[PDB]
């Protein structure tokens, strides 16, 4: 039972790391001629759920 | 050539001087290592030929465990290793231990390092003594220090920044005995003692700034701002004209303190901070730094230190009562500090008649204890006779009648 619970938490952690790897690779993939550059509503703000490094 | 030797006695002195010297390091270019990455630091720093800048301060305690944190903290490399003086056993809230038994083991060492610091300075203005009335070392060794400095360093200015005891809260039982037995022996040996107590600064940090539950560091930083505004005209009036323009009679050297904009960065956006606004806010009783009220007394003198860009009733014999000084450098924000960034500030130092209630309460509580002779055996057994209680009480009786006599 305890091994099952630990595997559950490690699977969730792997899921989170893959999705932010996707987001970071897209952010690097943008350049000076992408058509999705759109001067957004509020940069430099920090959301409510924000941990530190 | 416009130096100020600072002396920090007691835990209050050391923990205030930490904030003061962080601000003094950051106002100029000085890193906490001691190197700059212009000579206006010369009032507070010394330039070794090895590039290092060493402060003109002496930190004294009878206990080692508040100076060991300075020795192992971030500012470890800045201080000269023997400008920080420690004993072995503290004074233990005892004026007698702090004056007669323990402080005599350190008074000669402190005077030796003070002489070594004063030989470097060409033109020395005067000394600044930071202490607290309630403690053992800050009430005994401080008074012993002023007694042994008066005969040694001439008619120099001896300014004091004291934590006077708060009207209803304190962290000791035996505090009024110290708070009277130190005033009786520093009455003739001092020039000007600005008194701030912790309760009014708690009120201001709760009310003006929005810091509910502050600690001592949020108080030490505001004290550092006041000391910088006092000494800023040496770097960017003097210390010498304060004792002329604030102390008429030679026993009434007890002025007050105020810093005019103490506001947060989420309310500095909402308002002007013009000269009229900050001048009006100096004279407001909610913004004083002693829990008292100058409406119920009479003003005697005021010094207004501007920095950057029929309710008030005076005495019969002082009609003017105003000294004004202007400086051009705006105050400097520290990271992690709680005040905003502002262009103007005022510091007012005012001598008033409305401090008579503080001495009346102190005498009342001393009488309340001493009429039944509580706690006297500690003070008698440590090399101090009993009659000094009687002389200190009749002397402070004379002081209260002095505060009434000048008002009449």
């Amino acid at each position: 039972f305890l091994l099952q619970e630990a595997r559950q938490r490690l699977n969730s952690d792997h899921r989170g790391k893959m999705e932010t790897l996707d987001i970071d690779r897209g952010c690097l993939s943008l350049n000076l001629t992408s058509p999705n550059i759109s001067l957004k509503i509020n940069p430099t703000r920090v959301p409510n759920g924000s941990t530190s490094l | 050539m416009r130096e100020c030797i600072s002396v920090h006695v007691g835990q209050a002195g050391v923990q205030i001087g930490n904030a003061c010297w962080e601000l003094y390091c950051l106002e100029h270019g000085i890193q906490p290592d001691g190197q700059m990455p212009d000579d206006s630091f010369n009032t507070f720093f010394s330039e070794t030929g090895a590039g290092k800048h060493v402060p003109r301060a002496v930190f004294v305690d009878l206990e080692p465990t508040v100076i060991d944190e300075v020795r192992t903290g971030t500012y470890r490399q800045l201080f000269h290793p023997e400008q920080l003086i420690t004993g072995k056993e503290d004074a233990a809230n005892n004026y007698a231990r702090g004056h007669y038994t323990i402080g005599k083991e350190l008074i000669d060492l402190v005077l030796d390092r003070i002489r070594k610091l004063a030989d470097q300075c060409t033109g020395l203005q005067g000394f600044l003594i930071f202490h607290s009335f309630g403690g053992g070392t800050g009430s005994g060794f401080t008074s012993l220090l002023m007694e042994r400095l008066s005969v040694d360093y001439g008619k120099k200015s001896k300014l004091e920044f004291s934590i006077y005891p708060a009207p209803q809260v304190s962290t000791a039982v035996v505090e009024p005995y110290n708070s009277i037995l130190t005033t009786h022996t520093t009455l003739e040996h001092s020039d000007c003692a600005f008194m701030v107590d912790n309760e009014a600064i708690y009120d201001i940090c709760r009310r003006n700034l929005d810091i509910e539950r502050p600690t001592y560091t949020n108080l030490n930083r505001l004290i550092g701002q006041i000391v910088s505004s006092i000494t800023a005209s040496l770097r960017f009036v003097d210390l010498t004209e304060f004792q002329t323009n604030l102390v008429p009679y030679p026993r009434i050297h007890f002025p007050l303190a105020t810093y005019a904009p103490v506001i947060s960065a989420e309310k500095a956006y909402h308002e002007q901070l013009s000269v009229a606004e900050i001048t009006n806010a100096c004279f407001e009783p909610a913004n004083q730094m002693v829990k008292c009220d100058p409406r119920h007394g009479k003003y005697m003198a005021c010094c207004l230190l501007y920095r950057g860009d029929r309710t008030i009733q005076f005495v019969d014999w002082c009609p003017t009562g105003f000294k004004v000084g202007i400086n051009y450098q705006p105050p400097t924000v520290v990271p992690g500090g709680d005040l905003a960034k502002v262009q103007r500030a005022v510091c007012m130092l005012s001598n008033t008649t409305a401090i008579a209630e503080a001495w009346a309460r102190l005498d009342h509580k001393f009488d309340l204890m001493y009429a039944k002779r509580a706690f006297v055996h500690w003070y008698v057994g440590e090399g101090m006779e009993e009659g000094e209680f009687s002389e200190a009480r009749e002397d402070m009786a004379a002081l209260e009648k002095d505060y009434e006599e000048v008002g009449m």
Partner: protein, 428 residues
């Protein structure tokens, strides 16, 4: 550089000390061998207050373990932490005191004080500036009370300007397990008034009361009552080892709660004591520490502070907290209660704040209160001493050791006057 020598006598003082040292060694990261296994630098910084460095990185305590029988020196040596004690420090005799005060004070213990004073003169010379001593002993026994108050009288003639705390386990009238209890308790309170600087009074019926109604333990052993005492014993020495915003020596606490030289019997308390069912309900703040510290369900002595004025009060906080909230709760508990506090002392509560909490807690506190409700503790003893001695119930054990009947008369009026001394400030 303010070292503390631990002295511990009897079965009670050796089983408290086996748990106190089990608490300090966790606090400084010492395993049962003696090697530092920790995860800070504050723990190693002032370990010399209690520990002596050996060769190889070992640390041994500065404790002396005395007894009059060899039976309690083996269960101490066979505990979990029994192999850190230096083997010369065990001083044990081979004939017991036998629940007798006179054998502990005149016959058996008098041939052993000269073999203990040699030991304590060896740990008083390893200290660069010795702060003071400590004794843990039981007033209801024969070698905690005879030899224990024989050592204090011989220590205080050789180190007369130091600090001499005690942690007395005063007998209780309800939890009592000796017929001849009030003879030893009367003849030892006479020996503590003129030879100690502080004396914390502990009754075993108040430690059972806490372990039954607050911690809700099923079967509290003595090992769970020695953990309650040892949490206060390290709460009064916690600013000598860890830094803070407002420190307190042991000397600084002697100054503020001893107004007159014979009034030094206190009542300890420890603030965050809670169950295991009420752990997710507790909110973990400073007003919750102050409400439980002053609770009369919580004192470690069996006398209620609602029956008398509070002369003076202490508080020794631990953790990272706010000096406004610490100072506004001592004022708050003092203005509603007009006649629970003495009138000629206007501020009664002294506060100190250390900065490092106990291992596994966020914050903590401690209470050392000096009351005129402590004089009912010396009258239940003085109503049972005089019930027996008016007919000389058990005296032939005591007289036949070189002891006279007149010592049972001078130790009556010398405790009948301390009750009247605490009485004269009960009402002005």
């Amino acid at each position: 550089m303010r070292e503390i020598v631990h002295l511990q006598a009897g079965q009670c003082g050796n089983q408290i000390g086996a748990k106190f040292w089990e608490v300090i060694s966790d606090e400084h990261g010492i395993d049962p061998t003696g090697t530092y296994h920790g995860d800070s630098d504050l723990q190693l910084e002032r370990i010399n207050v209690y520990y002596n460095e050996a060769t190889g990185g070992k640390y041994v305590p500065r404790a002396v373990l005395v007894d009059l029988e060899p039976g309690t020196m083996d269960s101490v040596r066979s505990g979990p932490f029994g192999q850190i004690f230096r083997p010369d420090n065990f001083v044990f005799g081979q004939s017991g005191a036998g629940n007798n005060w006179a054998k502990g004070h005149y016959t058996e213990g008098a041939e052993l004080v000269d073999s203990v004073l040699d030991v304590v003169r060896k740990e008083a010379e390893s200290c660069d500036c010795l702060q003071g001593f400590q004794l843990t002993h039981s007033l209801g026994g024969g070698t905690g009370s005879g030899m224990g108050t024989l050592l204090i009288s011989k220590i205080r003639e050789e180190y007369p300007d130091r600090i001499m705390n005690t942690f007395s386990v005063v007998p209780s009238p309800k939890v009592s397990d000796t017929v001849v209890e009030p003879y030893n308790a009367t003849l030892s309170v006479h020996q503590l008034v003129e030879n100690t600087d502080e004396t914390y009074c502990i009754d075993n019926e108040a430690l059972y009361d806490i372990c039954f109604r607050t911690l809700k333990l099923t079967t509290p052993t003595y090992g769970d009552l020695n953990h309650l005492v040892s949490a206060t014993m390290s709460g009064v020495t916690t600013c000598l080892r860890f830094p803070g915003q407002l420190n307190a020596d042991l000397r600084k606490l002697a100054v503020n709660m001893v107004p007159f030289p014979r009034l030094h019997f206190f009542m300890p308390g420890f603030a965050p004591l809670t169950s295991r069912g009420s752990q997710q309900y507790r909110a973990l703040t400073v007003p919750e520490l102050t409400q439980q510290m002053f609770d009369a369900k919580n004192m470690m002595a069996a006398c209620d502070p609602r029956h008398g004025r509070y002369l003076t009060v202490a508080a020794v906080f631990r953790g990272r907290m706010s000096m406004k909230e610490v100072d506004e709760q001592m004022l708050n508990v003092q203005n509603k209660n007009s006649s629970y506090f003495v009138e000629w002392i206007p501020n009664n509560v002294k506060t100190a704040v250390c900065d490092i909490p106990p291992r596994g807690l966020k914050m903590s506190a401690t209470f050392i209160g000096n009351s005129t409700a402590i004089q009912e503790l010396f009258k239940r003893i003085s109503e049972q001493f005089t019930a027996m001695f008016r007919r000389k119930a058990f005296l032939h054990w005591y007289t036949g050791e070189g002891m006279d009947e007149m010592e049972f008369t001078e130790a009556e009026s010398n405790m009948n006057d301390l009750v009247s001394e605490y009485q004269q400030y009960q009402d002005a």
